Ligand binder design. Structure first.
Ligand SMILES: CCO[C@H]1C[C@@H]2CC[C@@H](C)[C@@](O)(O2)C(=O)C(=O)N2CCCC[C@H]2C(=O)O[C@H]([C@H](C)C[C@@H]2CC[C@@H](O)[C@H](OC)C2)CC(=O)[C@H](C)/C=C(\C)[C@@H](O)[C@@H](OC)C(=O)[C@H](C)C[C@H](C)/C=C/C=C/C=C/1C
Lengths: 107, 94
């Protein structure tokens, strides 16, 4: 599935609802720590609407159980991410992904 | 048919990103995008096409260039640079 490990706690009550827009900062890396993408390198947050299949399942289920302010470590199985095909040239086949993602606010 | 450039690029980009990101279809991605870039090439004929062009014209032309570079290089990195610009214009059109 996806494992969620807390780095810094959120307020414990403000969670995202389906259809809400989640504003996050993320740094993504392969399980060996090789970074492939980071919103912090760009200084601008990432937005996506929850429960719309805009993002991979691991993000949908992982971020859903985070509360505002919380910085967590998402360990995502290839099943909840890019699968056997992966993403050609970027993410290899059958890759477990690790995202450092902080839920900044809900809109 | 008659279509606003605002609307044409919105649905066009949604389609292209579905095909590339969702279905791994880069050939199909080129199919939907090329017509929209061709329309821009003949140039604005209304006030609404003129204002759209003034706002988003440079970004779209630059994105087409990164697609063009991908074509020669094989560097998937060049396609992502195109989509960075496409995402940018999309989220302003919305
Ligand atoms: C600069 C290049 O940057 C890319 C993102 C890169 C690509 C490669 C990835 C290593 C990565 O580096 O992200 C990455 O770190 C990462 O894996 N992410 C991005 C951050 C959120 C988690 C995950 C992800 O789900 O990406 C996903 C993943 C790649 C594809 C998803 C996966 C779930 C599927 O359900 C869906 O099927 C279609 C496609 C990409 C996105 O988050 C973007 C925003 C969203 C989409 C493309 C689709 O939802 C699309 O649907 C038609 C839309 O509705 C969008 C809004 C329409 C507009 C026009 C498209 C804009 C394109 C934006 C593209 C970018 C910013």
């Amino acid at each position: 599935g996806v494992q969620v490990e807390t780095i810094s706690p959120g307020d414990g009550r403000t969670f995202p609802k389906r259809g809400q827009t989640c504003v996050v900062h993320y740094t993504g890396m392969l399980e060996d720590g090789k970074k492939f993408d980071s919103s912090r390198d760009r200084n601008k947050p990432f937005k996506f609407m929850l429960g719309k299949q805009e993002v991979i399942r691991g993000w949908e289920e992982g971020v859903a159980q985070m509360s505002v302010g919380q910085r967590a470590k998402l360990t995502i199985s290839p099943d909840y991410a890019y699968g056997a095909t992966g993403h050609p040239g970027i993410i290899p086949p059958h890759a477990t992904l690790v995202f450092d993602v902080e839920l900044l606010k809900l809109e | 048919v008659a279509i606003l450039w605002h609307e044409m690029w919105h649905e066009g980009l949604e389609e292209a990103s579905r095909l590339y990101f969702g279905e791994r279809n880069v050939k199909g991605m080129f199919e939907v995008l090329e017509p929209l870039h061709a329309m821009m090439e003949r140039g604005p004929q209304t006030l609404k096409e003129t204002s759209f062009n003034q706002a988003y014209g440079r970004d779209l032309m630059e994105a087409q260039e990164w697609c063009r570079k991908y074509m020669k290089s094989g560097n998937v990195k060049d396609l992502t640079q195109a989509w960075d610009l496409y995402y940018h214009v999309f989220r302003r059109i919305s």
